[PDB]
Design a protein around this ligand. Sequence first.
Ligand SMILES: Cc1cc2nc3c(=O)[nH]c(=O)nc-3n(C[C@H](O)[C@H](O)[C@H](O)COP(=O)(O)OP(=O)(O)OC[C@H]3O[C@@H](n4cnc5c(N)ncnc54)[C@H](O)[C@@H]3O)c2cc1C
Ligand SMILES: Cc1cc2nc3c(=O)[nH]c(=O)nc-3n(C[C@H](O)[C@H](O)[C@H](O)COP(=O)(O)OP(=O)(O)OC[C@H]3O[C@@H](n4cnc5c(N)ncnc54)[C@H](O)[C@@H]3O)c2cc1C
Ligand SMILES: Cc1cc2nc3c(=O)[nH]c(=O)nc-3n(C[C@H](O)[C@H](O)[C@H](O)COP(=O)(O)OP(=O)(O)OC[C@H]3O[C@@H](n4cnc5c(N)ncnc54)[C@H](O)[C@@H]3O)c2cc1C
Lengths: 550, 550, 550
Amino acid sequence: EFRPLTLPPKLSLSDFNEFIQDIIRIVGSENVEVISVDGSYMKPTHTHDPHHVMDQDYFLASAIVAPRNVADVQSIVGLANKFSFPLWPISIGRNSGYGGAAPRVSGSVVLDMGKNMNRVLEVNVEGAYCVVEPGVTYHDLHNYLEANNLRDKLWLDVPDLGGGSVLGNAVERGVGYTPYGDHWMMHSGMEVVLANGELLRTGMGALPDPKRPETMGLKPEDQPWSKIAHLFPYGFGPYIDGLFSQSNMGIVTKIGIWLMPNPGGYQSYLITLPKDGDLKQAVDIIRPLRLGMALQNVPTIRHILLDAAVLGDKRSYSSRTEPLSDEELDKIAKQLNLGRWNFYGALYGPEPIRRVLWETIKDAFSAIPGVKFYFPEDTPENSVLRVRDKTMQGIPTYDELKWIDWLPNGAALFFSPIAKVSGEDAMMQYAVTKKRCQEAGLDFIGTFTVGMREMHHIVCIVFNKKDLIQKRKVQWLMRTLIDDCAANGWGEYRTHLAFMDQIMETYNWNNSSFLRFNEVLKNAVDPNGIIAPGKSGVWPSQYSHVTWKL
Amino acid sequence: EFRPLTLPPKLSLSDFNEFIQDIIRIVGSENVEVISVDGSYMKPTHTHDPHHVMDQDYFLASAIVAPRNVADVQSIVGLANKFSFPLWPISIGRNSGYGGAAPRVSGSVVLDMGKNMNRVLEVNVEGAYCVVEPGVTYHDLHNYLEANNLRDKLWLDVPDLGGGSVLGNAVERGVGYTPYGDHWMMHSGMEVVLANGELLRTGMGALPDPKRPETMGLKPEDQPWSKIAHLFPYGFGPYIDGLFSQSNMGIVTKIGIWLMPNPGGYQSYLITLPKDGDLKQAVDIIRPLRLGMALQNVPTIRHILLDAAVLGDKRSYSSRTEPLSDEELDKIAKQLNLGRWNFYGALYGPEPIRRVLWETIKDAFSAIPGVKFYFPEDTPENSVLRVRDKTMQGIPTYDELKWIDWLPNGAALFFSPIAKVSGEDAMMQYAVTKKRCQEAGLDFIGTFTVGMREMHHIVCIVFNKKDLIQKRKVQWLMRTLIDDCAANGWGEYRTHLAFMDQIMETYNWNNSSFLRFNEVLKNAVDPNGIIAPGKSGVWPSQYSHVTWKL
Amino acid sequence: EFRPLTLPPKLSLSDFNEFIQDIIRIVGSENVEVISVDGSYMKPTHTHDPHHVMDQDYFLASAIVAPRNVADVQSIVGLANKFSFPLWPISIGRNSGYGGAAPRVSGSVVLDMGKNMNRVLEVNVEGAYCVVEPGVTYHDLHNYLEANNLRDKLWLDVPDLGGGSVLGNAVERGVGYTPYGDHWMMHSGMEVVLANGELLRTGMGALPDPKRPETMGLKPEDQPWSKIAHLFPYGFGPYIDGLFSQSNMGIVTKIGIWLMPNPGGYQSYLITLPKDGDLKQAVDIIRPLRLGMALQNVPTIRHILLDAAVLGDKRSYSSRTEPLSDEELDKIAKQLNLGRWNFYGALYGPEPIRRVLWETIKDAFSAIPGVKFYFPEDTPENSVLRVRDKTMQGIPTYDELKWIDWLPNGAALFFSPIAKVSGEDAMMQYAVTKKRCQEAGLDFIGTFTVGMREMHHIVCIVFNKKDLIQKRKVQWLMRTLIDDCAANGWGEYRTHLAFMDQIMETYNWNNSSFLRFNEVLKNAVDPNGIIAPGKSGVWPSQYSHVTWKL
Ligand SMILES: Cc1cc2nc3c(=O)[nH]c(=O)nc-3n(C[C@H](O)[C@H](O)[C@H](O)COP(=O)(O)OP(=O)(O)OC[C@H]3O[C@@H](n4cnc5c(N)ncnc54)[C@H](O)[C@@H]3O)c2cc1C
Ligand SMILES: Cc1cc2nc3c(=O)[nH]c(=O)nc-3n(C[C@H](O)[C@H](O)[C@H](O)COP(=O)(O)OP(=O)(O)OC[C@H]3O[C@@H](n4cnc5c(N)ncnc54)[C@H](O)[C@@H]3O)c2cc1C
Ligand SMILES: Cc1cc2nc3c(=O)[nH]c(=O)nc-3n(C[C@H](O)[C@H](O)[C@H](O)COP(=O)(O)OP(=O)(O)OC[C@H]3O[C@@H](n4cnc5c(N)ncnc54)[C@H](O)[C@@H]3O)c2cc1C
């Protein structure tokens, strides 16, 4: 195709046309689409942000290209370096609340790795790992284990939804809820296409599999990996793996992710905390238990509107347009059999071990008046606990998508700071965020996900995407929250395309030493600045800061 | 001082003299030493390799410089960039078996960070972490916890000896034996002086501590850290921390290391395996247990000569000059009440939990004929179990230094490949290594340290450092082992100065893609190539490969 | 001399020594001083900041050099470009509250232009202007006019003290209180030594004086100026004069400043405003009057503690260590016969004209209850009005120096934002600043100086320079005020050395477009970055931002 809505920087329409003809001959007309529709979670869009906080077409691809295999990504990168065409690689494109599949720089080709590079490459039982391509979603990996009956020996670790990409999510350093919840720390052995187009394998993946007749003459992408590749992630020398997470330093084509053995015993549970103020005592209680491993997985503390929004839109609970009152939150809590805060967790391992920990957990949460303990069986058929019971054993579900429908044309945007695992800090973060949410006219909706020495506080901002006034309030909100949390010593761990610059500007100790160093690294490996310029605030030097920053 | 034995590359005697007068005025004559003695573990040398496999003066400093603080490192870096003088930073300089304090390039200044930058900067109880400077040895951190009575709340994780540096060891990705044994994975928040001399803090350390009257006007090195700096290592954007382990990308001035809470119950144990061939069954047994966490710490599988060498030199068991026979190893085993292989481990937590796991461990090791189970009380006063009982609870000891005295002027050199956690692989690596040791005329001495999905096999080569014939056999051995292990799909995780190029050459998948990328990074950040050139085989472009590689 | 406390960046001791011997042979040993004392207003220091907010030696010269004439500055510039030595030019060095004579970069040579380049070059009566060198203080220019009896034809315009430099103050865009109070707007024709060392004259000064026998053979610095040089500032083409105010783009050697003709009638006056809240009504009143020119000069609105501090230290009014209360300020007001706010002004011209405006002023201020009107005769012998009566007619005094002695070892630091000429805005800025001063534990002390469409609000922070705790609170205060005022839409017009980067960061519309442009200009004209690097936050490219910004 001939004429796109937006062309990448400094590129002419003829270069665009030459380039797109070049890619079409490499991958076929069925794997290329020129943009000359927000869609669904089911068939995500790959052209722009479906949960658009800015105008819909603000972050817009000029074309979508689907490589057939690693060789095609090498050729595409060569082309982009020839024409200076920025690429924006995506795996599944479901980064909802974070920009979706939209590029930071409009005019970029969205590189759709996941359409054709789909394979579950290996599932290794003795080493309890899997190797995967960008296109394997959590649902797909689950089906792979089920079809081969591997569920009895190995379990997966999934986020709240099941359509996301195992590799995609892990390179963003996403989180899950079993004891393998720290996705990025469970990796070992990644394959990357560098900006120069050279293939590179990290860790023990750089120690080549010894030659043998059966693997002679295979292209590098197609070679097997040496025995320790997916078992010990460090290899030898500088450990460069992290340069590839939340970065623009390369295109990840394959990754090994460690899988937990069936634990031989499982029990999910829900602890309802009656009062809004019970967050403080609960976190204080969670601290020592999470450090000493009575709390085995990544347990969450859900605010009552998160659960309420899973079960029904705002219209179903109130006809109010403004934020529900405190008294109304107590009525919704009572209506659903939940507290104002709901703690979700799971015990793993043999009964004798589950028993002891469970009594420790129970006994410690008993200092909170009115606490109530439930197992999935004890709750209604449509409960969040019955969904999270599946979630905390690695089974993918889609039920929790429903909270995005809290409002009319509900879109999501995530404010994601990190808090200490302390009631004092958690209340304070809450207090800060709640106050700005109410100034903005939005219900506070959020969850804390409990890590070992930190909690990821996901404030779920939901707004009407067809309401220009509220979109502007969301943007006012997000920007102020960033600043306020920064003034209180808290940083966000992951964000949307429009907030990357502002969030990187917050990590400016010693006059921005941290981004300068990233900048130095980036321009050495991408001298044409073709790999997703702007991702995380890191700009190659051909992208003036005055022009491009937000 | 005026005239060093060796000058760094391309530097004149006059530039050397100017430089050293420049350093003397910054740090004082007491903190600078010109080299115009192997020493002890007690007072390590900082001029060369005390366990010299090459000639003693092969790797030699021109001078030793001890910065007083971070400002001094900054100024020293500026001078090195002015004169193009290569710096070799050390923390404690006890990297015995790995080159000690010796620089890869002779003529380099050895930067002694540990003499004056010694401080335990902070021990945080609620967050269960500590922040430290290069000079805090494990023994020092231990004493710090004892003086303040923190041992009841927090434990350390130590390597076999206690004199090493907490930071030094951790940036080498060193290993320990409690559940916090993956030293590098326990870090969060590092401070680094870049090659350009700029101070940088990683992760959440880049999110500055909010201003307040009490901290106004403090030099950047002296500023407090924001609340989440030592609690969540990822921060935001590219996770660049790993670029600083086993690298020459920076000079680490401070690091945060997560500390394990007193577990409320501890019991070490020893499981003796009668036969040489029992390794295989044992590892096959260890696999599922380690994966399902019945084995909580990093348990080890010591070969009988390791324990034997701790208890007495070779002269005490035989007057032989050649390797002890198999029949002799069985006699030494019997004499000491140990098997041919000895498995050391520890159970953590409340009694009810220790009980269940201990029965699971017992029962699974029972499939090996003649297995015997000991607690420290059950063994003699000089046993390795009573020493390692301390070691698996983070208490520092120095007893295990005695195996370096197996031979007359015993020096150590470590051959450190990684193996799958499988009887088959472990036997095979053992077979390969044992064969080459006997060809070399040396006793096989070693340990396997059990990681989750891998084992670190430390073959401990001990030789007479005053025996030129054997030193040459050591070098013949090491180099052949590298190749043999590489030809069987195994790579080493850490190595000595003289083997770094050969070991990086082994991680050459796709025509050395991994080292080219490291080179690209290094020359961007060190355009004068003044930070430890050659470390891990990574050479700045001013250091011709033909000239410098070994 | 041989060994300075601090050397400029990247310079060796030997280059320093060579350089200083080179300068000594150009200007003599009497004109050069190596720094191997805070002093007084009378004999200002030229080595560091006498009103030090940071440690005393924080901003420190390596040497002081006093050029004999323009040729000497040219040669000094050549040497600095040869050695890359940063120069910090000063005229008188009395920039008290703004860093004094201290360089932004420590190690810089302080260039003392005023010691030897002292001359009143010309006082032209028909054109009502004067031409001056860096060393002509206002007191000196005053004496020059008196000696020749020119006071009857021409008046000066002075700042609160008389020792400052006419040129120095003017290139800082300093303010005065007659109708000629916008010092920078009264200039026409400047002479500058560029960074490359070339002499340049601006405006009509670029149109050379026609040749004539009497001026043949004169060095360029010594040539007369063409007739219109000091009469029309614009010249032809780009008007580049402003690139030389509050900048590091050149070294100003001579300037022409327009002088007001004796007005043929003068009467100063004081209007006391009883209440703290009367600021608002007063400013609302001042607005139309200032715009329609009933208020002819630059009238000021002094806070009661400013006048109180001129008359006696804090010990004389209270023995309190904390801020005086509101009730105490009313008592001090009553004691001195002043309001809580005191408006000082002056009427110029023939009696008939003074009469009419004076009735217009009186009548409009009459809407404020309790207002009282004084002429100098009506007040006591030690009043501020009798001092400012002199000040509003261009006569230099030193009386107002006494407010710096409010506290024990009182030092001054100025927080200088701009406010709209509106009661609403003025109160609001006052509210913001007063709140932060009380949190800091300091008395609020300040003045508003009334411009045509804006007011310069000088918050005069006075602190004990030997009190480390309060110095830190001063720094905490200053930095928070900057941010607070920025968050309310107000920027500072001038600042001290330690706040320059933070204040330039505030003028960051469109991703700092304004400073990028300044950077581009500066590196073209100073490729060695030797003229006052860092002045106003503008850094030559050899000065890494990470390293140098505060
Ligand atoms: C209701 C809801 C719930 C969510 N719950 C969770 C949760 O529990 N945990 C969680 O972590 N997230 C959660 N998310 C956030 C996000 O939706 C998921 O993390 C999702 O899996 C991320 O998208 P993806 O991995 O499918 O898609 P992708 O669009 O592939 O996103 C990948 C992103 O990482 C980079 N990237 C991806 N692939 C590559 C590659 N091959 N090479 C280089 N860079 C690459 C790019 O920066 C890109 O923007 C949730 C979102 C919603 C809407
Ligand atoms: C008998 C014996 C037993 C051992 N047992 C163990 C064991 O169980 N586990 C284990 O891991 N090791 C073991 N070691 C190996 C090694 O001796 C220890 O890891 C020791 O702690 C490493 O030295 P160090 O950390 O004190 O000293 P250092 O000499 O400080 O070594 C640090 C090294 O890392 C780098 N480095 C250090 N500090 C910095 C800095 N500030 N900035 C930049 N780079 C830096 C340099 O490359 C340097 O060579 C053993 C050694 C012997 C002789
Ligand atoms: C009690 C008190 C009251 C004050 N009242 C006033 C007031 O009413 N109005 C006011 O404006 N200020 C006031 N000031 C602020 C300041 O003290 C005066 O402006 C003073 O005249 C400025 O110093 P200077 O001009 O003598 O000295 P200098 O130290 O000469 O300062 C000149 C500055 O401008 C630059 N500069 C000077 N000469 C040159 C040159 N030749 N070439 C290039 N750059 C040059 C440099 O950046 C330098 O730092 C006051 C200060 C105090 C302590």
